[PDB]
Design a protein around this ligand. Sequence first.
Ligand code: CL
Lengths: 53, 158, 52, 369
Amino acid sequence: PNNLDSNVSQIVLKKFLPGFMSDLVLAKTVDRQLLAGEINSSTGDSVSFKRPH
Amino acid sequence: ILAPVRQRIVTDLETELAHFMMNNGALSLGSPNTPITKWSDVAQTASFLKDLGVNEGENYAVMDPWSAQRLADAQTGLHASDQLVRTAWENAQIPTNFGGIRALMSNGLASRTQGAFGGTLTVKTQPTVTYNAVKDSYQFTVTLTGATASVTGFLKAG
Amino acid sequence: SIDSAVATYEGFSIRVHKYADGDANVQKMRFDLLPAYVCFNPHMGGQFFGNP
Amino acid sequence: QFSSLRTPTGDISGQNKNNLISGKATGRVGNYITVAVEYQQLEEAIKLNQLEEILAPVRQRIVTDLETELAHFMMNNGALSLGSPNTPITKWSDVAQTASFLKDLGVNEGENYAVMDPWSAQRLADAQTGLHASDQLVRTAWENAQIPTNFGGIRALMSNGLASRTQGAFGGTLTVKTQPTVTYNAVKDSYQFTVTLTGATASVTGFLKAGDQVKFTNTYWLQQQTKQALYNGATPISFTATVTADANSDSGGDVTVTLSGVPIYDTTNPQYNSVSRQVEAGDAVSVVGTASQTMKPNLFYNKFFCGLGSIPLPKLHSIDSAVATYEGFSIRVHKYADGDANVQKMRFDLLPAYVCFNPHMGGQFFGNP
Ligand SMILES: [Cl-]
């Protein structure tokens, strides 16, 4: 009956396991050009575009 | 430790887009209890956009993993083009254009709950819908009558 | 009087602010983003299901 | 994993920031694997020729008994479940459901595998002889009864060495007796939890056996990143866990079992939830399959689910030895003898090691009724 357990360490290696993930689809198919850079500090919180006649 | 923080932001950006779009768009096709199975379940969306007059840019339909699969299962059953059945037998892929509309699979997609309604509903007062009232929004208030006695959350957003 | 930096992932920008707390000996960091939305025409989209 | 607040201004004053809660997975060393032989000096003289051929199969015994224990190890940990043992694999949509379930939960890294026995691979081979279009693809299965490398958008493999399991005799209608403590603090170092069950049959030895699968009807899997429940067509996908060891039903019909996979639902740290709600005392549950059935399960898993390793063994002193690898595993042999009984002894050894990184990345699958 040896007892050697105090000769050694409990080691946690420095690496992580793969987590889960999700995919981004809606984000990349809507219109992103029209509204870009259009709202700045001269404009207040909103801006408008024209409906066709 | 903090590397995941950025993709939490983006994940939560796009769960809002799902809700924003869901609370605005006025069009509806088919019954909400029934899952997408037939080819003509995706195809009805291209043709309704068409019949209504929309011509500009592309059109997208977006469904979950489980629907995408039953659609490939439908394509393993085609009788004619062997490049189109091989792809789905190996890969469970469907093509880029499907039904005459650009079709896409997304596991991030939001859900929503109906909210408890009952009774035979009618309008209480004729609303005012002319081009001059709704000109700037395309939204309008209407008051419905003949509902269940009193309920919190009788109709929920969406 | 608070220290910052800005990063890019997915073609979005995120500020980060690093402050602390004097009396509780504590360090705090927040990452934030402002989206904008537009609905051009409500009649051009919607929700679809199967036909039984 | 983190969560986020959504506010008109951005004022977070009265609210809760994310805590940091670490967790870890742990590997362990297993039993030795040993094959030992002996024979008299008299036999070495008159009776043993080609002794070197007499012990060729000895090293493949070692590696065979490694693969058989590995298969049990997996079958006992992975929580996921598809189909049910009463229906054999037939349709294309059987192998296919597994790849799209791994994607709906969000497994993105490495490669996914499905593994089945010869009888299953044959029923998938004549499903492939029925295709109406692809010319080559039917000819191959008609000739050779083979199926492609990728099948259903997962990578499919056949193996004749694979373990079986017996269900064990369960009956009556079951419900949970008390609330389990499932928060991320309790389960974060293991991913296992104990729960007591009610309404079982009076006194039964082996009421549930290691490898069974208990299903919680009203508690649903989430998507792990997005946190929205999972729907397959009309119906939600229930949560399911695996019985890790044998469990007996005491008189009065109670059963206390340890399960692998956890229905985490945490109020204080909701960012870690697995599932749509809190399992409460009085919830219906049921065991997948029929009472005393036996069978060989099919396994589907992500690459980082289980892992395997082996440990160099040092040399005993005053004894002679050498190392030889077969299938990329190193095996010691010690050759020693007993001077008084006049016999000769050889032993061949290997030490394995096993991790289960995540229980929620693998499981067992059957067909759909
Ligand atoms: Cl035909």
